[PDB]
Amino acid sequence: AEAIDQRTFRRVLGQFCTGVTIITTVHEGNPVGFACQSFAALSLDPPLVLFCPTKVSRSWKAIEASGRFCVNILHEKQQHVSARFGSREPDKFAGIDWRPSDLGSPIIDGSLAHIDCTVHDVHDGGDHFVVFGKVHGLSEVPERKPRPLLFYRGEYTGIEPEKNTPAQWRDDLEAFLTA
Amino acid sequence: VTAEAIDQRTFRRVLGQFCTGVTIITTVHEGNPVGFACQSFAALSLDPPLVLFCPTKVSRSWKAIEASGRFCVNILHEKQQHVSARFGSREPDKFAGIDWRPSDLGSPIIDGSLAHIDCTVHDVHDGGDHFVVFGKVHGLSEVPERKPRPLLFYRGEYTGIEPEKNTPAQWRDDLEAFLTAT
């Protein structure tokens, strides 16, 4: 009954659709990363983001040690990259083109956007941590078609661009960070 | 030394490249239903079962949620763009013309939503010009069943999925698996 309760959490929370990130660092010379969907924009002033690694994550411990990370937001053509980071295969950056950011963290070629960060604060979050990052630089790749990789009810998907609709807002007290 | 190095227009443009669902987060306070639209939501923990959301420090709804001690998260269907629009307006009664009923804890469920999650306030942290609020999950539901077509927000616009793109996914590394992985 414990395992069924956990299956229900996974299914119901899966109804909230998200993009997909790879969060990366370099620790003593080698590139390190993990796939993550528990990402959000947090604050404009100061500029902050958050992400939620598991308490058992090996990749987060490398980020904690360096104090630096880059967030790569994935394009739908990068489904293979996400699958690679999700596996137990060694040498995860093999065959994947990348370059260091201004702070030294891996930027993956072909992404929609990247965000160059330092670790700002860390909190306990049950069986996960919540990590705040301070933003030091960011950009989107020009002329790449805006088609994000999605994750919804346990499967990869993408958008139908014919559905794109302008949004108007008036309540300034509750403004989205991205409007 | 106080540093200002990030342009605000650039922040909004770049962070909009991360696509999200759309929620309405609700409570009852001083005999009235209260709610707001929010994209800063995430699944947080399995054991214990937790979620998080991030209201602005100036939020009217957060003051009501803080006082009552409880909230319900409603995940919207693509045909509910009109609900998100009303909650994003300055109308004095936002629940007018929108069908709703109380959850087991006593917070508004929006009829026609894809799913809802019934919570109590668990902890609260400072997050710059926002707060980060943790909720303890007491109930959750994805019925009555509706065709699985979520309302999305991407690059400052509403959108939706192409269901022909839906593809199964496998995850061998248990130490890093998503909370919602099958």
Structure tokens at B39: 């994209």
Distance from CA of B175 to the nearest CA of A (A): 5
Amino acid at B22: V
Structure tokens at A59: 């990749």
Residue found under tokens 């919602």: B180
Structure tokens at B126: 């400072």
Q: How far apart are CA A49 and CA B15, in angstroms?
A: 9
Q: How far apart are CA A139 and CA B85, in angstroms?
A: 29
Cis? peptide before B144, omega within 30° of 0: yes
Q: Is B89 helix (H, G, I), strand (E, B) or coil?
A: coil
Please answer whether residues A119 and A129 qualify as being in contact, where contact means their C-beta atoms are separated by less than 8 angstroms. no
Q: How far apart are CA A63 and CA B5, in angstroms?
A: 23
By what method was this entry solved?
X-ray
CATH says B1-182 is which class?
mainly beta
Element (DSSP H or E) covering residue B168: strand B167-168
Cis? peptide before B108, omega within 30° of 0: no
Please answer whether residues B86 and B100 qualify as being in contact, where contact means their C-beta atoms are separated by less than 8 angstroms. no
Structure tokens at B45: 């923990």
Kindly give the pairing relationship between strand B70-75 and strand B115-127: antiparallel
- What's the per-residue H, E or C state across A43-104? ECCCCEEEECCECCCHHHHHHHHHCEEEEEECEHHHHHHHHHHCCCCCCCCCCCCEEECCCC
Q: Is A161 helix (H, G, I), strand (E, B) or coil?
A: helix
Q: How far apart are CA B58 and CA B53, in angstroms?
A: 15
CATH says A1-179 is which class?
mainly beta
Q: How far apart are CA B11 and CA A46, in angstroms?
A: 11
Which residues on chain B are in Cβ contact (under 8 Å) with A135?
6, 11
The 10 Å Cβ neighbour count of residue A166 is 7
Q: Alpha carbon of B141 to those of A12, A13, A178, B149: distances in Å?
A: 7, 10, 29, 16
Distance from CA of A95 to the nearest CA of B (A): 20
| Interchain proximity A138–B42, CB inside 8 Å | no
Please answer whether residues A115 and A105 qualify as being in contact, where contact means their C-beta atoms are separated by less than 8 angstroms. no
Element (DSSP H or E) covering residue B64: helix B60-68
Amino acid at A58: R
Distance from CA of A172 to the nearest CA of B (A): 9
In chain B, the largest separation of any two C-alpha atoms, in whole Å, equals: 55
Which of A9, A58, A138 has its CB closest to that of B10?
A138
* Cα angle: A110, vertex A129, A63; to 5 degrees: 50
Q: Is A30 helix (H, G, I), strand (E, B) or coil?
A: strand
B window 91-110, beta carbon within 8 A of A: none
- The order of strands in the sheet holding A48-51 is A30-36, A21-27, A68-73, A113-125, A128-140, A48-51, A39-43
Closest CA to B74 of B46, B30, B38, B50: B38
| Interchain proximity B12–A177, CB inside 8 Å | yes
Q: How far apart are CA A105 and CA A32, in angstroms?
A: 9
Q: How far apart are CA B75 and CA A13, in angstroms?
A: 9
Please answer whether residues A136 and A104 qualify as being in contact, where contact means their C-beta atoms are separated by less than 8 angstroms. no
B35: left (phi over 0), alpha (psi -120 to 50) or beta: beta
| Interchain proximity A161–B159, CB inside 8 Å | yes
| Interchain proximity A127–B61, CB inside 8 Å | no
Please answer whether residues B157 and A166 qualify as being in contact, where contact means their C-beta atoms are separated by less than 8 angstroms. yes
Please answer whether residues B60 and A174 qualify as being in contact, where contact means their C-beta atoms are separated by less than 8 angstroms. yes
A window 119-158, beta carbon within 8 A of B: 123, 125-128, 130, 132, 135-140, 146, 148, 150-158
Q: Alpha carbon of A36 to those of A22, A71, A172, B117: distances in Å?
A: 6, 9, 30, 22
Q: How far apart are CA A176 and CA A163, in angstroms?
A: 20
Which residues on chain A are in Cβ contact (under 8 Å) with B167?
79, 155-157
Q: To one decimal place, what's the resolution in Å?
A: 1.6
Q: Is B16 helix (H, G, I), strand (E, B) or coil?
A: coil
- How many CA atoms, within 13 angstroms, populate the side-chain half-sphere of residue B39? 29
Which of B47, B128, B165 has its CB closest to that of A158?
B165
- How many CA atoms, within 13 angstroms, populate the side-chain half-sphere of residue A73? 29
Structure tokens at A132: 């705040």
End-to-end alpha carbon distance in chain B: 47
Which residues on chain B are in Cβ contact (under 8 Å) with A168?
85, 88
- For B13, phi then psi, to 5°, come to -65, -50
Cis? peptide before A46, omega within 30° of 0: yes
Q: Where are the domains of chain A?
A: 1-179
